[PDB]
């Protein structure tokens, strides 16, 4: 029952890679203190692989099979299709892992008859063979983070036409099953800001509310064949085509429950027998595999009028309070149970009594106010790995730009406005790539997005009091003044100066680089500007992207209008 | 999670109940204490009910987990088919409970157009339904016993057409699957000859042999929903028709799972949640279940290279001993496992290292004699039920003649042999019914036998040394002398008087009779006879006889 058996073959990159900083010369305008900031590489993932192996055991209680029943009657309602062939290979994107059968993704999205001849007979495959394992590649991440140093993650994934297929049998489950199932605790079909609605509206529903996030230790590894067999029978409540159930028994069987690992070189390195970190189900599967044993927990504990809220592995609980002490208590027994059906907790759980001192999804609800001088509620987060991030993003392009999904994201807080928006808006000025679409991921998926639409599609997400929230919380600035001092990042005067310059420089430009001027960076200006609905907003399809989270599911999808 | 609710609509008759023994002329020759013999009736129903009726919690391990794939795995190897309707309907005893909508036993043996019309519509229904709960009747049995009283059991059945309905979609899966996922652990595909050979040769291959019987309390109500869930994936394991994939899906949701209990006056009693008494898949569904749950037990425990044998509810394991203290240790950690799987027990299992103290089946093994003095072990148990019964069959006509399935079983048997051939034969010779098909019960289905067949039957099943066994165990011998000074019946010395006047009258009728005496009774002469094969033997079909378990199955068979 060990999570993963090893060769000893090394886990191998793909290509050169860097731990350092990079630096060019627009790096010290943003940090100084280089040496806090790295890149996790191959060399660690040795560390990882011990860290993530281990044996797990499971004692499935009353409770459990109870809130399993309640969830398999919703899973009943929900009516799937199977995707065409042209209709996966549409949401691969450009730049996915090649097939070792001899096409990339390149082919996959053009539809060629090489990569489409293969992909049928990947399918036709999985409809006649349910036992024999799918081969894995496992990598090591490339992520950067500030020190204070942790080894690199790992990625376990099937080859391309294997994903096709996935996405063929359960691209319309995952999307949809999740929300059937758990209702408004589904954290992936919110927004930000609809996540803090949802949070603040559960708060006050209580008399004497108590919240906690629990952190389960490296979940991937706690999922057992179990989970996986019982997620498989969850997908097969709905109504499905015959093919469709077919091949997702037959992906359940070769590749969900475990698998050979091979690494770059082609050299077998052991075998997995928990979650893969890289498949269409990673989010789905771990959203409703934490739900289920949080939900049998809480019971279990008897915590009192629980409202939950999931996002894959992550998880925070809204209760009735029960005193201080006995809430500590009552942890400890949620925490028991918890362990019993494989989740041990990473850091234990504490009790907290405001809600704005509980992280979940690295984020917490903060309050600042708008032009009225209303309370307004929004979601921040510590700013430490986003600009540990940009800093590395300002001299390498990556194949990923976490600044560009952070200002979507956190459009409304503080650093994304003054340090953010208006270090990349300088880069992307003198470059003039204002229009240059680039990559970015919103929970877990990937899109190609134009700078020059960040002012429209924040004020679809956000609203237009993104571009004037004021007055932000003693902690939160104390928070963000930290960690710039921490970092040798120049304090936030300097960057209101800056975003004055770069202001006039895209009001100079005129047409949507001035929108930009005007929207982004109206909190910059003493005599503020009117700020009414921007017309072409409306036009933007914006449907599809908060309904599903798709970490490791290799999901694309390009901004249109 | 609570085994039933009831409502306090009364669990009724359906038809005037005896408790008292019925006397007759006869009555006296067998059994003198009558008081110490009476028959359950609906009148300790309620008793019944209180001890049948609790809240079940279960707690699954990975031991629970590994046994179960390692079940389905072999469940896999199976190929089942589905029976037709005539084949169903010739399985159907003759006088089984009649169908509330109007045709009976005789009409769906008979094929009657009434019957198939309406076993069709039954059919269709279970592939286009597979929620709604199907009704179910409850009885109180009337049954037998020896006092120190005991309240009736509950029996629970479906109507007629969906009997039928389960039989067309689960025969040949009762009837296949259970020896191919246990394999010699699967009692019912033995004879007793051949379960005390398995027993045997089981107790000599270990170094030092320990052994155990498992009495689970009340099985069927600790049967919950996860189990019967747990028995139809095994089942689907099976290469099967979707037409019968589909009607068995529907029979666990609608009918194995649970569903409403209605009294014979049509009154709702309540509702249960656990096993059903009377339906096709009572006897391997708890066969399955109780495997599951103790060969899980024993890997908890760290039992030491164990064999188990199971019946139904019934549990027997003989395992490598690891000291006294040690063996009844891990005993008591299997009991603490298998209470954990919603399995608890009625007596504390205790160790035994005598293969002939352990009573499993409500039998034991035995040792005695054959013609060349040879040790032969063979299957017998303590007389109390089979003498309580025959007193009552003496002056009672019943639908099930004990009587006849213990002579039987139990051929070889001390007490079969001087008791319960001598008594019967004489009967039957007075009412010159030996040629008179009589039905009995084998593993719970129900044969029509003819008394006649009884040597060359007994010769199958056990050899032509049944009818030669001598000098019994001592202990063998002394409760089968107390059990008749018990219930006040003629000590041994007398019926070995007694069988020499029924013999002589078997011979004196000739044919088929004489055989009768001759071999059955060749123990009561001085000056025994030559007992040679009997040619018409080989000729009975009895393949079939010792295949599975049928208890509440209603089956039956020629």
């Given at each position: ?46 560390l990882?692989?011990?860290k ?43 730049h ?37 394992p799918?081969?894995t ?6 992520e ?9 993650r ?22 949809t ?34 919240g ?10 706690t ?6 067999r ?13 093919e469709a ?43 409703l ?30 209760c ?11 942890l400890?027994?949620?925490?028991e149970?918890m362990?019993?059906?494989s ?7 504490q ?11 690295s ?28 800093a ?15 200002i ?6 503080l ?16 470059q ?10 919103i ?15 924040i ?7 993104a ?6 919380s ?7 003044a ?11 005067r ?16 005129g ?29 933007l399809?914006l449907?599809?992207?908060?309904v ?14």
């Open positions: 029952h060990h999570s993963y058996t090893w060769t000893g073959a090394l886990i191998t990159p793909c290509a050169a890679e860097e731990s350092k900083l990079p630096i060019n010369a627009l790096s010290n305008s943003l940090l100084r203190h280089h040496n806090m900031v790295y890149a996790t590489t191959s060399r660690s993932a040795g990882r692989q011990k993530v192996t281990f044996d797990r055991l499971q004692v499935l209680d009353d409770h459990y099979r109870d809130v399993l029943k309640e969830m398999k009657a919703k899973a009943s309602t929900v009516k799937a299709k199977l995707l065409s062939v042209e209709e996966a290979c549409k949401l691969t994107p450009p996915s892992a090649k097939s070792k059968f001899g096409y990339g993704a390149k082919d996959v999205r053009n539809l060629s008859s090489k990569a489409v001849n293969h992909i049928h007979s990947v399918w036709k495959d999985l409809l006649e063979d349910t036992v024999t799918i081969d590649t496992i990598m090591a991440k490339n950067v983070f500030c020190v204070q140093r942790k080894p690199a790992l990625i376990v994934f099937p080859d391309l036409g294997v994903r096709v297929c996935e996405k063929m049998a359960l691209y319309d489950v995952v999307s099953l999740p929300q059937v199932v758990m209702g408004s605790s589904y954290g992936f079909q919110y927004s930000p800001g609809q996540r803090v609605e949802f949070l603040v509206n559960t708060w006050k529903s209580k008399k004497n509310p108590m906690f996030s629990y952190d389960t230790r490296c979940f991937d590894s999922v057992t064949e179990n989970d996986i019982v997620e498989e029978s969850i997908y097969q409540c709905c109504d499905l085509a015959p159930r077919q091949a997702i028994k037959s992906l359940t069987e070769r590749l969900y429950i475990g698998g050979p690992l091979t690494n770059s070189k082609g050299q077998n390195c052991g075998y997995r027998r928990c979650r893969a970190s890289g498949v269409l189900t990673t989010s789905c599967g771990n959203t595999t934490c739900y289920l044993k949080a939900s049998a927990a809480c019971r279990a504990a008897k915590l009192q009028d629980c409202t939950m809220l999931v996002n894959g592995d992550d998880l925070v609980v809204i009735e309070s029960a005193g201080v002490q006995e809430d500590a208590a009552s400890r027994a949620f925490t149970a362990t019993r059906y989740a041990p907790p990473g850091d234990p759980p009790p907290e009594y405001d809600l704005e001192l509980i992280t979940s999804c984020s917490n609800v903060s309050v600042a106010h708008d032009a009225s001088g209303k309370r307004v509620y929004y979601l921040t987060r510590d700013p430490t790995t986003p600009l540990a991030r940009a590395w993003e300002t001299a390498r392009h990556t194949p990923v730009n976490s600044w560009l999904g952070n979507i994201m956190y459009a409304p807080t650093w994304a406005r003054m340090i953010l928006m208006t270090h990349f808006f300088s880069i992307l000025l003198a003039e790539q204002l229009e240059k679409a680039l990559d970015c991921q929970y877990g998926a990937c899109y190609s997005i134009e700078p020059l639409d960040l002012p429209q599609i004020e679809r997400l956000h609203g237009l009091s571009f004037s929230l004021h007055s932000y003693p902690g939160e600035i104390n928070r963000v930290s960690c710039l001092r921490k970092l040798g990042v120049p304090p936030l300097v960057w209101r100066h800056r975003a004055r310059s770069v202001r006039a420089r895209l009001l100079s430009q047409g949507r680089a001035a929108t930009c001027g005007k929207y982004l960076f109206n909190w910059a200006v003493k005599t503020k500007l009117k700020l009414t609905p921007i017309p072409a907003a409306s036009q399809d449907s599809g992207w908060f599903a989270g798709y970490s490791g599911g290799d999901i694309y999808h390009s901004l249109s209008r």
